[model samples]
Target: RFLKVKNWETDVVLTDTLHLKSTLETGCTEHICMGSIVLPVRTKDQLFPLAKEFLDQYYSSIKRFGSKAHMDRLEEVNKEIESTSTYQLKDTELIYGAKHAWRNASRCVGRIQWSKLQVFDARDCTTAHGMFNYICNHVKYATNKGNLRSAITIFPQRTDGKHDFRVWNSQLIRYAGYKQPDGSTLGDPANVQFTEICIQQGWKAPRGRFDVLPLLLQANGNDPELFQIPPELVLEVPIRHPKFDWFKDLGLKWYGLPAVSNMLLEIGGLEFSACPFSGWYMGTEIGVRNYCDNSRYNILEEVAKKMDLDMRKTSSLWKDQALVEINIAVLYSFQSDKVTIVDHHSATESFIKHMENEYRCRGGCPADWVWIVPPMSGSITPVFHQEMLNYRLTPSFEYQPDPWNTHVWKG
Candidate 1:
């Protein structure tokens, strides 16, 4: 079945601009972008109402435990409660008590008490703010930079998993930083950042699966004549299986057993391989060792010869092995020295040429199966981008140089 397509015009345009600038500056080399953003609030107006409700609910809930505690125990609980309330207070001397209250209230609302804040749809007091704050703080601690873009990318349609593995319309922005041409870091004193404050209202398939082809092809504006043909296809044919499928059954049994029960079974089976032969077998072993001094080396040599034949036979085992059938699909992106644009057009061309060359030479496998390209910059922050870029390009296939064939004269 063909996959559905969705357009990411905004994301594409932004990525293109970033790609062009970075390529020009760095000689077409690629880098990875990293960072997140922290969103800002307009006013305490929306928060105040939720804050009031949270405070009221908190005091009411704890009032039930007021009389049951021992004097010392009661004092400790009260201190902890006070500590939680003090962190919650926005503004006073007595407001310190509200701090802990606010923190405890936020904790309650985040995971355990999401239902409490679900009354108003848009104005509901969700801990998205808290999440954004955490990401920003994490980036700062790790990278020591604070101006990051942590925003969501929004898509008008559901995304299929195949072609859009890393495409997201809305993401939370945490922190971003600027880097110099010589690869030095830059810092921003002002905490200026932008968050893509949008809601993802639907579900879609993830990228990097078999279902994204149709959408990708359509998005590229390919002609109907060529739409039937995809660029590159990967076929993972089952080459061989053990007789009686012993490996499959053994794997299944291992996974099926409970951890504690499996451990007990393993303990009982210790020295199971040394059954029947015990102390007397050691004396017999001495006699055999003296009689067969070179037997071990001979056995190893024979086994090696057999293994070499098996390896060659295995290579030609399948019927019509020369024309191996493969599953065809498009590669959406390549990450190497940088992210290479892996749209339908480029990917199709790369795949066809690769396959044609392989078929002519009977190549074992295509070495450079996927082209490595730079990642789009806006997807991540600028800090550690170069490192990430290097990480992606490290695994490119090595090209083998042609062998020298000069003949020497007989002396």
Candidate 2:
């Protein structure tokens, strides 16, 4: 459990006991917030309590609390957990838990549409080959030919923490990065290491700026296998400005589906290590972080120079100007191409309403202010002015160590 206490007059935030322990363990300070930090793994002793709590929550949601069926299921789960040290979730429970996980993910600004997320339960999938087929199906179904829909594909939970199903790529669809001989990146520099791994695993890099990377999927503690996503299933939007024709000459393009593949989905102490979820992107995610971040494409200076702005002078606000145009180009391109996307202003406004609704229902909404606010034009966004409390709420999405970095259990 987690807690946050804030005082207005003194502008002090405090929490004590186990809640404070959870916060402090993440290295949260008065000035530094670890709201988006990965939650620690729950111990075996903690599992049954969480499981029982979630069962109660599930039964309550359906108005079946204290019912005979609910009692029977609870007893059944108790016995199963006592014997096997873990229990399996019913498909309906899995569905409900997944929806709640999305709702409880404090870092996501799009929780307003949490209930609408489609879940594909691939728990029976036993091999990396099977994982590939299900993932392709998820891509095709969620993509909807550029009319993107929110969806997640869940593979089996690990028998041991060390023997798990996992997606190696951070996102299902990402551009390949190549380390050039001149110490420069030829593609997305952020993915240079992953691109090398893919190459080592027999993927042929096209040496292009936006070549879609192949999927590296690991199942049941084995080494990951590389699988190329079919190009037809991937919907790409060409980055072109509505006003500037030269922006088209930049030949920039991005995939419509922003499927996050590496996040662990935890429900009632059970971890699904290979659940990939996706939704439509906010314009700023691409225009600000991906395209303009110095570590990523670092295209702001080039765009500024292309616009004939004085890049040498900081007061000229050339980066800001280029950022706006890039965002506009992203929005216009997506619109013209009939792809699903949201702009920062509209997304933030919707988030404010979501917070209001959550407050009315749950008395509080867990939020990481640093993440909720847009990367660009932070003050201009409505979320920037509002204070937020950050805390962990389960069932939730938690960050896990990369599959390659962790030790495998020999069963």
Candidate 3:
């Protein structure tokens, strides 16, 4: 089973007919796995249609890339789709697929730069060392000396005849979360589970405010290797409120990159389980959600009290005010650090333009309204006013198995 729909904002799998709460948010994912979205293990009859869809998308993209001459390749792929029951994407095909995967990612309002995605193909990689090597480059190059660039390094996809090669970490950049005496977490609460697993797997848990997690790479039967990311490769921004002097005492900070490593990258009909992709963060993605969410940093009340807003009354807009300030601080801090970050308004404007272009070219654009609209300031952004379609789309990226659950982390 997939997607418990804790609200309209999440998706997941496993557990006893349980509603798998999507801890990782992907606004565009509406796979409705209560029924369809049976990609990984379908009947032999079912794979043909899936292969055909992917092959067609690939051929169309080949033509778009200034060549009407992919039919020969298309014909071969079509036969392979039936004869061998699979097809391997060449470098050009993989590049286009990666770009389109980004373009077709509906929940993301940053699709305007989809075509500019940097794709590093690593399908040949078969060992943890190999995964670490390529991903190290992925982080170093995309980290871009603090001016982060969007990039995705794709690894081997899960095929019909073989198990998937996957990276266990949720992101290339994350901080260690240490549980305390009062059951409180010091550092990024999000990584608490992964952090524990890594330590259990014999990783030396350093007591640091922001320690990047080791790369947990699993290539099928190979034992998972934990590789430490060079501290210099990570770009973190120390956060402070522009006007609030006390905010400096809060000691809040965030990473410059938001490279998601755990999600499944379904391109055309292939599932790249180890494809880690990153984009520069939007201000509120850090300020409002990551920092204010109940499970993560949970700093809403702290900031609200600091602002002297009435905590007793929800109508007093204490949370709203704090959220505004938090987002403001993120934008200001990133700007001060010369780091790349997009504000909600600008991101939506770009998304709208991308939608318009997509609609004009592709006839319709699929999206989740709640996701497209920033967590804060729904009325102010044009995305809030515009209608959105939340439906299942293939060749779309979706959440996959947790590496720990899959026995890859081996805790």
**Alpha-carbon RMSD of each model:** 31.0, 3.8, 7.9
**Tens-digit per-residue lDDT, 1-411, candidate 3:** 532222122222111221131122333335533222233244546665666566676766556422545556666667776777666887987887788777767678998898889999998888888888899899898988878889999888877424678788888888888898899888788888889878877799876766778877788545577889888888889899899989867788999999999888776566788889998999988998889999888999898888899889899988889999989999999999999999999999898777767655665566667578888888788777676654555666887768667553334
Q: In model 3, how large is the Cα lDDT of residue 178?
A: 86
How displaced is residue 379 in candidate 2, in Å? 1.3
The better-scoring model by TM-score among 2 and 3 is 2
Top-lDDT candidate index: 2
Q: After superposing candidate 3 on the true structure, give the runs of residues whose Cα lies further than 4 Å from its correct spot.
A: 1-44, 64-69, 78-85, 160-162, 408-411
Instruction: Order the candidate numbers by lDDT, best to worst.
Output: 2, 3, 1
Q: Candidate 3's C-alpha lDDT?
A: 0.77
Clashes of 2: 0
For all candidates in order, the CA lDDT equals 0.19, 0.86, 0.77
Tell me model 1's lDDT, rounded to 2 decimals: 0.19
Q: TM-scores for all candidates?
A: 0.14, 0.92, 0.85
- State which candidate, 1 or 2, has the greater lDDT: 2
RMSD of 3: 7.9
- Winner by TM-score: 2
lDDT of 1 by residue, 1-411 (tens): 211111232221111111111110212224632222111011233333333333343344456333433233434433543454311221221122222221122101111111121110111112333222332333232221211111111111111211111111111111112234675422211111111111112213222112211111011111111011121221111111132222222111000000000000000001000000000011111111211124311122222242333334545533122111100000110111121112322333343343233233321111111122111112222211111111111101111111111112122
